Amino acid sequence: LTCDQLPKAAINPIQEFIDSNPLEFEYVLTETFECTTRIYVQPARWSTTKAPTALDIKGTQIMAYDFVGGPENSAHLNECHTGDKQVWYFQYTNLLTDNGSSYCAYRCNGTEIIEYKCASNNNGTDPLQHQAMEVAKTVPNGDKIHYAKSNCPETHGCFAFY
Amino acid sequence: LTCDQLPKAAINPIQEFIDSNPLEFEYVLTETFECTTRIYVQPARWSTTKAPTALDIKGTQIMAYDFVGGPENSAHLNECHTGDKQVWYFQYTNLLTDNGSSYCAYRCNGTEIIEYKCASNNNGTDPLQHQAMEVAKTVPNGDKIHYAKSNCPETHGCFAFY
Ligand SMILES: *[C@@H]1O[C@H](CO[C@@H]2O[C@@H](C)[C@@H](O)[C@@H](O)[C@@H]2O)[C@@H](O)[C@H](O)[C@H]1NC(C)=O
Numbered sequence: 050l051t052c053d054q055l056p057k058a059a060i061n062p063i064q065e066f067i068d069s070n071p072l073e074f075e076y077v078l079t080e081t082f083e084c085t086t087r088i089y090v091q092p093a094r095w096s097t098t099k100a101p102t103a104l105d106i107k108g109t110q111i112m113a114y115d116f117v118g119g120p121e122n123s124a125h126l127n128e129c130h131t132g133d134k135q136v137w138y139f140q141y142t143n144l145l146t147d148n149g150s151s152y153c154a155y156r157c158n159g160t161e162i163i164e165y166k167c168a169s170n171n172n173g174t175d176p177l178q179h180q181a182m183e184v185a186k187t188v189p190n191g192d193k194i195h196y197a198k199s200n201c202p203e204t205h206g207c208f209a210f211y
Numbered sequence: 212l213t214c215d216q217l218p219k220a221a222i223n224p225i226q227e228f229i230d231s232n233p234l235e236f237e238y239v240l241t242e243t244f245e246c247t248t249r250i251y252v253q254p255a256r257w258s259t260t261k262a263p264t265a266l267d268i269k270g271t272q273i274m275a276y277d278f279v280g281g282p283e284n285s286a287h288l289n290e291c292h293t294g295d296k297q298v299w300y301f302q303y304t305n306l307l308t309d310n311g312s313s314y315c316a317y318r319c320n321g322t323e324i325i326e327y328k329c330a331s332n333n334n335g336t337d338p339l340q341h342q343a344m345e346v347a348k349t350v351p352n353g354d355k356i357h358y359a360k361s362n363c364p365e366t367h368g369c370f371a372f373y
C-alpha cells in the first residue's frame with residue numbers, strides 16, 4: 050500500500066467539525082502535532098474567501114490554516130502566518146456519535162506519507178481510529194506514526210489547553 | 212463614574228458566543244490584546260468542570276482561559292498556562308444581529324479599570340460599541356483605552372489570523 054492509495058473519505062459539513070470542538074490528536078507523524086488541540090472555526094463575516102479555519106494549538110503556540118475543498122475529497126490548507134499550502138485527505142471520519150467524534154487525516158508526498166493527524170474528543174476510544182492508524186503505518190514512511198500524548202506538560206486548571 | 216459602577220450586563224448563553232466566532236478586538240486597554248482574535252470553545256467532553264474556554268489569539272501566540280459564571284453576571288477566568296484567575300464583566304452584549312455581534316467587557320481593580328476588551332465581527336460598526344467605549348474611558352485609568360488595530364501585521368491569505 051502507498052499513500053496515494055489510502056482512502057479519500059467524504060468530508061463532513063463544516064458544522065459537524067465545529068460541533069466536535071475541542072479535539073486532541075492521538076496519533077501523529079512528526080513531533081510538530083504532539084500534545085496538540087484542534088479547533089475548527091467558521092469563516093469570518095469579513096472573509097472574502099469564506100473559508101473556515103483549522104487551529105492547531107500546542108500550549109501557548111498556535112498554527113492556523115484557512116481551508117477550502119478541492120478535488121477528490123481534498124482539503125486545501127493555507128497556513129495563515131507563512132502562506133504555505135498543504136493538501137490533506139481523510140482516511141475516515143466518525144463525527145457526533147454517542148461516544149463522541151474521531152477522524153484520521155493524512156498528507157502525502159506522492160507514494161510516501163509526510164504528516165498524519167488522528168484526532169478525537171473521546172481519548173482515542175473509537176475502534177476505527179486504532180484500525181486506521183494500523184493501515185497508515187503500512188505506507189512508505191508510515192513507520193514514523195506514533196502516540197501524540199506520551200509526555201505532555203502538566204495542566205494548570207484547564208483540560209484542552211496548557 | 213468608577214469601574215465598580217459600570218453596568219454588569221446579562222451574559223448570553225455560551226452557544227451565542229460560539230456562533231459569533233471569530234471576533235476581533237476593536238478597543239483595548241493595555242497593548243496585550245491589540246491585533247487579537249477571540250474564539251469561544253465549548254467544554255471538552257473529558258472536562259470535569261465542563262467550563263467553556265475563551266481563546267485570545269495574537270498571531271502565532273495564544274492565551275486560553277477556561278471560564279465559569281460567578282455572582283452578579285461575572286465571568287471567572289482561569290488562564291490555562293499560568294493558572295492566574297481573573298474576574299470580568301460585560302458592559303453590554305449585542306450578539307447575533309443582522310449586522311453581526313459585538314460586546315464590551317472589562318476587568319476592574321476596585322474603582323479603576325485594568326483591562327478592557329471590546330470585540331466584534333462587524334469591524335466596530337455597532338453604535339453601542341463606540342458608545343460603551345466612551346463611557347469606559349471616564350472611569351479611573353480608562354484614559355488608556357485605545358484602538359486595537361492601528362498597526363497589525365500583514366496577512367498571508369487568511370482573514371482572522373496572521
Ligand atoms: C486516555 O488514554 C490513556 C491510555 O491510552 C492508551 O495507552 C497509551 C500509552 C496509548 O498507547 C494509547 O493509544 C492507548 O489507548 C490513559 O493513560 C489516560 O488515563 C486516558 N485518559 C482519560 C481516561 O481521561
Ligand SMILES: *[C@@H]1O[C@H](CO[C@@H]2O[C@@H](C)[C@@H](O)[C@@H](O)[C@@H]2O)[C@@H](O)[C@H](O)[C@H]1NC(C)=O
Pocket residue numbers: 095334335358
Ligand atoms: C474597518 O474600519 C476601519 C476604520 O475604522 C475607523 O477608523 C479607525 C482608525 C478607528 O478609529 C475605528 O474605531 C474607526 O471605526 C477601516 O480602516 C477598515 O478598512 C475597515 N475594515 C473593513 C471595511 O473591512
